[PDB]
Amino acid sequence: DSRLPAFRNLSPAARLDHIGQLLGLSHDDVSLLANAGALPMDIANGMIENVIGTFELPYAVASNFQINGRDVLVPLVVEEPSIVAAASYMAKLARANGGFTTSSSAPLMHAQVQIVGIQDPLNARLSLLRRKDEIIELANRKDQLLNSLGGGCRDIEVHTFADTPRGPMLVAHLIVDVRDAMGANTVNTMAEAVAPLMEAITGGQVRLRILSNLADLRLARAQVRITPQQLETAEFSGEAVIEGILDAYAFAAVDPYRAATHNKGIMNGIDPLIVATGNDWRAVEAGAHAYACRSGHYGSLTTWEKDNNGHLVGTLEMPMPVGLVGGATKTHPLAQLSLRILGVKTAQALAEIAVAVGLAQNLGAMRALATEGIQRGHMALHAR
Amino acid sequence: DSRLPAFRNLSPAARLDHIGQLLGLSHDDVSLLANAGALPMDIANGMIENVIGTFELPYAVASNFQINGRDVLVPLVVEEPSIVAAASYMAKLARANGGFTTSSSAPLMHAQVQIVGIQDPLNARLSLLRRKDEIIELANRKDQLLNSLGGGCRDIEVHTFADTPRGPMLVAHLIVDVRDAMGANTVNTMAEAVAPLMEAITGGQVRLRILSNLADLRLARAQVRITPQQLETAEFSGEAVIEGILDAYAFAAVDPYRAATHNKGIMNGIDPLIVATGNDWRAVEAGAHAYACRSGHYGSLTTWEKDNNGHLVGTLEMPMPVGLVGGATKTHPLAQLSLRILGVKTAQALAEIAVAVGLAQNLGAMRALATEGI
Numbered sequence: 001d002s003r004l005p006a007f008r009n010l011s012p013a014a015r016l017d018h019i020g021q022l023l024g025l026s027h028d029d030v031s032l033l034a035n036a037g038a039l040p041m042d043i044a045n046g047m048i049e050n051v052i053g054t055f056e057l058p059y060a061v062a063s064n065f066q067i068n069g070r071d072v073l074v075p076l077v078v079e080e081p082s083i084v085a086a087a088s089y090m091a092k093l094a095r096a097n098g099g100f101t102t103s104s105s106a107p108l109m110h111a112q113v114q115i116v117g118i119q120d121p122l123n124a125r126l127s128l129l130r131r132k133d134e135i136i137e138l139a140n141r142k143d144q145l146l147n148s149l150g151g152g153c154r155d156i157e158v159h160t161f162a163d164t165p166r167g168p169m170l171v172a173h174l175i176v177d178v179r180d181a182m183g184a185n186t187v188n189t190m191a192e193a194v195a196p197l198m199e200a201i202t203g204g205q206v207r208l209r210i211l212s213n214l215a216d217l218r219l220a221r222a223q224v225r226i227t228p229q230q231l232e233t234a235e236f237s238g239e240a241v242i243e244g245i246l247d248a249y250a251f252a253a254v255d256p257y258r259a260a261t262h263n264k265g266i267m268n269g270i271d272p273l274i275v276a277t278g279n280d281w282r283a284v285e286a287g288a289h290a291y292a293c294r295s296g297h298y299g300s301l302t303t304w305e306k307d308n309n310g311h312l313v314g315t316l317e318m319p320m321p322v323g324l325v326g327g328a329t330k331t332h333p334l335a336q337l338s339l340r341i342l343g344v345k346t347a348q349a350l351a352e353i354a355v356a357v358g359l360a361q362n363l364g365a366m367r368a369l370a371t372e373g374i375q376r377g378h379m380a381l382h383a384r
Numbered sequence: 385d386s387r388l389p390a391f392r393n394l395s396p397a398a399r400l401d402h403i404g405q406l407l408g409l410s411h412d413d414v415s416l417l418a419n420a421g422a423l424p425m426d427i428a429n430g431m432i433e434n435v436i437g438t439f440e441l442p443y444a445v446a447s448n449f450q451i452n453g454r455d456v457l458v459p460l461v462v463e464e465p466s467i468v469a470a471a472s473y474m475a476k477l478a479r480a481n482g483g484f485t486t487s488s489s490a491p492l493m494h495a496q497v498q499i500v501g502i503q504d505p506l507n508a509r510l511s512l513l514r515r516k517d518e519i520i521e522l523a524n525r526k527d528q529l530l531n532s533l534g535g536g537c538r539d540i541e542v543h544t545f546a547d548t549p550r551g552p553m554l555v556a557h558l559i560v561d562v563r564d565a566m567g568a569n570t571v572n573t574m575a576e577a578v579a580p581l582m583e584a585i586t587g588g589q590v591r592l593r594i595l596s597n598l599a600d601l602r603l604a605r606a607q608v609r610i611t612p613q614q615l616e617t618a619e620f621s622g623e624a625v626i627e628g629i630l631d632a633y634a635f636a637a638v639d640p641y642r643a644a645t646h647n648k649g650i651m652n653g654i655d656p657l658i659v660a661t662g663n664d665w666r667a668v669e670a671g672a673h674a675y676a677c678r679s680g681h682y683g684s685l686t687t688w689e690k691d692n693n694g695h696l697v698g699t700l701e702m703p704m705p706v707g708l709v710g711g712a713t714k715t716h717p718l719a720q721l722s723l724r725i726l727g728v729k730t731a732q733a734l735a736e737i738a739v740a741v742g743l744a745q746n747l748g749a750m751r752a753l754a755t756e757g758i
């Protein structure tokens with residue numbers, strides 16, 4: 001059960017103990033949170049360069065979250081107040097209608113093999129596509145362990161840019177199926193592995209061989225439904241809040257200035273979960289925002305509609321390149337503990353949870369903005 | 385002097401001591417970094433909700449960084465390796481040509497007063513513009529202290545959207561000059577303060593009254609110059625690396641897939657400095673990426689050119705809404721220490737340093753990508 005009565009009123013230690021026997025955490029786990037210094041300086045000096053100490057941020061746990069029926073405790077790490085309070089409140093509201101319904105796609109990341117110096121980019125493109133299976137085999141032969149787990153290269157997509165400032169270019173895409181890893185290093189290696197062969201076929205000169213953070217092939221989805229009766233406040237009625245939420249969305253869909261803050265709200269829920277799991281939060285931000293302006297217009301990441309049943313339905317679909325076997329995820333004592341609290345067994349499972357927390361946050365942010373204002377809640381929670 | 389010989393080889397304690405007497409830090413400061421738990425649980429339980437403990441990340445210090453002649457030590461907080469090593473290396477290279485040259489604009493943030501229900505958005509627009517000074521006075525009367533420091537409302541910009549899915553809308557912008565604060569709360573209050581008056585003039589129904597993180601009015605700039613001779617490697621020559629760096633930029637400027645990673649690298653340097661200062665890293669990310677696609681095309685945040693002198697010149701201009709008097713910046717013992725190491729006296733001073741670290745990072749990321757080929 002994710003519901004935690006009077007949890008916000010409970011003392012930190014009381015909370016850590018409650019969460020402890022609830023999940024059945026060993027003392028060895030509770031001690032990592034009980035005392036400061038869970039990350040030894042010998043390990044901290046192994047992650048970054050020029051380490052002189054450690055910086056710490058609050059480690060909270062959101063409640064009420066329910067993904068596909070299964071209850072789950074979401075660990076968050078931020079400095080901004082109201083975030084954990086809103087994510088949990090909206091999560092409580094979604095419960096009454098089935099919580100959050102999520103889904104995802106195969107962990108498909110893609111490398112880029114930039115080739116310049118070609119005089120016939122278009123012709124050379126077909127040369128690559130026709131010898132695609134060769135290029136694929138070579139890529140896989142490098143990372144066979146990945147193929148053992150069911151991952152590996154799946155397909156190649158060659159694109160051209162004859163309008164490049166520095167002459168025509170040929171950018172081939174290696175759609176590699178990573179597994180429970182973000183795929184950064186896995187993909188980057190395959191890119192540098194096939195680099196020689198592609199260069200031999202097109203007769204060009206390979207430049208960059210890096211992955212693309214705009215993982216539009218590794219999407220994660222999340223849905224919610226909010227009955228008007230649930231949003232009925234003392235002043236405003238249920239119906240009144242729904243229209244407001246809809247106006248707030250229309251605004252963000254047409255004006256980039258509002259879209260910026262709107263999407264920022266979404267990230268406020270996703271980022272904290274990423275830092276806690278030890279994942280690269282910057283990769284998530286880059287793929288999120290870039291996907292938000294894929295139609296030549298910076299728009300909203302979430303969508304808020306009112307089904308023909310009167311209910312408020314919102315969704316969230318965005319690139320979610322997150323892992324479980326990554327570098328920092330395995331070396332940080334708390335990163336491993338975060339995964340244990342979540343109970344996630346795969347990267348995509350974690351991905352689905354991340355987009356659910358975001359969809360919830362955005363809902364809470366807009367509900368307040370349309371209800372009264374933003375100061376009442378945030379500022380109250382923003383004491384001192 | 386920001387140069388730190390064999391700093392990377394020095395032990396953590398050795399580094400903390402070296403940084404200690406260099407800056408003349410008291411034992412009270414060094415102890416915050418020496419021992420774990422610089423952030424007491426009573427304070428940690430006051431920032432976020434449902435706090436059960438604390439999460440810690442490495443706290444590093446980049447070297448060689450020189451902004452406008454003045455040397456400075458940049459504190460960074462990340463989990464990804466190579467970041468602090470690259471930012472410091474490229475910083476060492478920029479030294480030979482004057483380090484980094486930065487500049488900024490007045491800390492101008494802007495609120496949004498969305499007004500729906502108006503049947504004549506365009507006409508109602510002029511009604512607001514003509515009674516602008518009234519709306520301005522009311523806004524300032526609220527935050528009297530801000531005006532004492534030289535901040536306060538400066539101008540109002542009303543925009544219309546008759547093409548909105550939910551009918552026509554009227555979005556007025558309150559260009560408020562915050563000072564050393566990000567302006568979030570300062571601006572949000574003024575927006576809700578003028579909300580009634582605007583509603584009276586246009587006859588509409590005010591909806592949202594929130595700030596816009598796309599702070600394109602609070603820009604920060606940074607420039608660098610890299611002599612080809614400096615980039616000359618064992619295999620590749622100086623000239624050879626410059627062209628590669630240029631190819632790498634052209635790629636990001638035309639293709640969004642490369643731009644995403646390109647800009648990600650820039651943030652790899654800016655974000656760590658933000659977390660260390662206790663600032664909202666997410667606001668920075670939102671304003672950064674949104675500004676990257678302001679021309680209907682997601683492009684590069686930095687620019688790499690080759691002056692008619694043969695040298696490689698790069699720049700960086702982006703929204704930098706960062707503060708010094710914010711909520712978390714003041715309550716975190718280390719956030720205050722980070723500001724002390726930086727020696728910054730204003731928010732914009734910190735803003736200029738943030739864009740310099742980013743411009744350096746992007747340079748290092750591309751240099752490597754172009755250097756070690758097939």
Ligand SMILES: NC(=O)c1ccc[n+]([C@@H]2O[C@H](COP(=O)([O-])OP(=O)(O)OC[C@H]3O[C@@H](n4cnc5c(N)ncnc54)[C@H](O)[C@@H]3O)[C@@H](O)[C@H]2O)c1
Nearest residue numbers: 080261562563564565566567568569570664667709710711
């Ligand atoms: N990014 C967003 O969309 C968003 C929105 C709302 C709140 N927030 C949160 O609010 C915080 C940032 O808001 P804030 O920094 O405006 O709030 P704040 O209240 O902490 O700081 C502003 C206050 O500081 C005072 N002040 C003193 N000296 C000042 C100076 N020299 N210059 C400017 N103001 C000065 C002012 O009186 C003002 O009331 C962050 O913690 C952020 O998480 C973010």
Ligand SMILES: C[C@@](O)(CCO)CC(=O)[O-]
Nearest residue numbers: 261262265266362365594
């Ligand atoms: C609440 C908000 O206006 C500010 C986030 O601090 C953003 C959003 O609408 O999602």
